[PDB]
Ligand binder design. Structure first.
Ligand SMILES: C=CCN(Cc1ccccc1C(=O)NCC1CCC1)Cc1ccc2c(c1C(=O)O)OC[C@H](CCC(=O)O)O2
Ligand SMILES: C=CCN(Cc1ccccc1C(=O)NCC1CCC1)Cc1ccc2c(c1C(=O)O)OC[C@H](CCC(=O)O)O2
Ligand SMILES: [Cl-]
Ligand SMILES: [Cl-]
Lengths: 149, 149
C-alpha cells in the first residue's frame, strides 16, 4: 500500500488533466496536457517515480495499459504496471468524487491565473493541504516513513 | 530545516535546468525550461509547494529574489522567499558538486531519450534513489514525518 498509485484522466477547457492518486493517502500530482498519449503518460510516470517510491500504478484505461511507451517508462522507473479494473466498486466512486472536487477547486481559483495549468497546480496545492485531522500531504509522508522504518 | 529549499539554475544543451534542493536531505526536483524567467520560476515553485511542505525558499539569484511574479507565487503558496547568499561557504561547493553530479548522470542516460527533459527526469530519479545507507528520497520523508510528529 505505501507504493500504490492510481492514474486518472479528466477533461476541462478542451484540455486533459492527468492525475496520479496515492491510493492510501489521497495525495495527488497532476498536469495539464493537450491530449492523453502514451508518451505524455510515460513522461508523467517518469516524473512521479523520481519523486515518490512508486511500486505499482493502476493505469486509467486500456490504451495506457497496452501502450508500449507507457510499459517502457514503467520498466525504466521500476514500476509494476497494472490494470485499473475497479474490483472494489468503491474506487470508481472515489475517483469520480475526486474529479468533481478538483474541478470545483479549479473553478474557485480560475480567475487567479490566465492559464489552466496554473489553476490546476493551485488545485493540487489546495487538495494536498486540506485537513480532513490530517492532510493528504501529511498522510503520504507518514505512510511512507512508517514503511521505511 | 524540514521546510527549507534552495533553488539552483544550471545550463545544458542551450537550455536551462531549474532545480530545487531540499537542503537537509539533498532530495531534488528539476525541470527543463527555455530560459529562466520570473514566470517559469513562479510556476516551478507553485508545483513544488503543492507537493512538499515548502516553508522557505532560498532563491538562486537576485533577479528571482526581486521578481514580483516570483514573490506573488511565494505569497500564494505560503513560502517565505529569501536570498541565497552563502553565509556558509560550504553551500557554494555543495550546489556546484550537485550540478556536476547531475550533468554526469544526464550524460550517462542521454542516449536513452531524444529530449533533454526526459534525460533530466531520469537524472532526478537516479539522484533521489541513490543510497549514500539511505537515499535522499528516504531522508526527505523521514525528516518531514519526524517534523509532523
Ligand atoms: C516513443 C517515445 C519517445 N522516446 C523514445 C526514445 C527516443 C530516443 C531514445 C530512446 C527512446 C526510448 O524509448 N527511451 C526509453 C523510454 C523509457 C523512458 C524513456 C522516449 C520518450 C518518452 C516520453 C517522452 C519523451 C521521450 C524522449 O524521447 O525524450 O520526450 C519528452 C516527452 C514529453 C511528453 C510529451 O511531449 O508527450 O515524453
Ligand atoms: C505575471 C504572471 C502571469 N500570471 C498573471 C496573472 C494573470 C491572470 C490572473 C492572475 C494572474 C496572477 O498574477 N496570479 C497570481 C499568481 C500567483 C501564482 C499565480 C500568473 C502566472 C504565473 C506563472 C505562470 C502562469 C501564470 C498564469 O497567468 O497562468 O501561467 C503558466 C506559466 C508557465 C511557466 C511559463 O511558461 O513561464 O507560469
Ligand atoms: Cl503538502
Ligand atoms: Cl524516491
Amino acid at each position: 500500500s505505501p507504493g500504490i498509485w492510481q492514474l486518472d484522466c479528466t477533461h476541462l477547457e478542451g484540455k486533459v488533466i492527468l492525475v496520479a492518486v496515492h491510493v492510501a493517502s489521497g495525495y495527488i500530482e497532476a498536469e495539464v496536457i493537450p491530449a492523453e498519449t502514451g508518451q505524455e503518460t510515460a513522461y508523467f510516470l517518469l516524473k512521479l517515480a523520481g519523486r515518490w517510491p512508486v511500486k505499482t500504478v493502476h493505469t486509467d484505461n486500456g490504451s495506457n495499459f497496452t501502450s508500449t511507451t507507457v510499459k517502457a517508462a514503467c520498466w525504466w522507473a521500476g514500476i509494476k504496471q497494472e490494470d485499473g479494473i475497479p474490483y472494489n466498486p468503491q474506487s470508481q466512486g472515489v475517483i469520480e468524487s475526486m474529479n468533481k472536487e478538483l474541478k470545483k477547486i479549479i473553478g474557485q481559483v480560475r480567475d487567479q491565473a490566465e492559464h489552466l495549468k496554473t489553476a490546476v497546480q493551485m488545485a493540487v496545492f489546495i487538495h494536498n493541504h486540506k485537513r480532513k485531522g490530517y492532510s493528504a500531504g501529511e498522510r503520504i509522508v507518514d505512510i511512507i516513513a512508517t514503511d521505511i522504518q
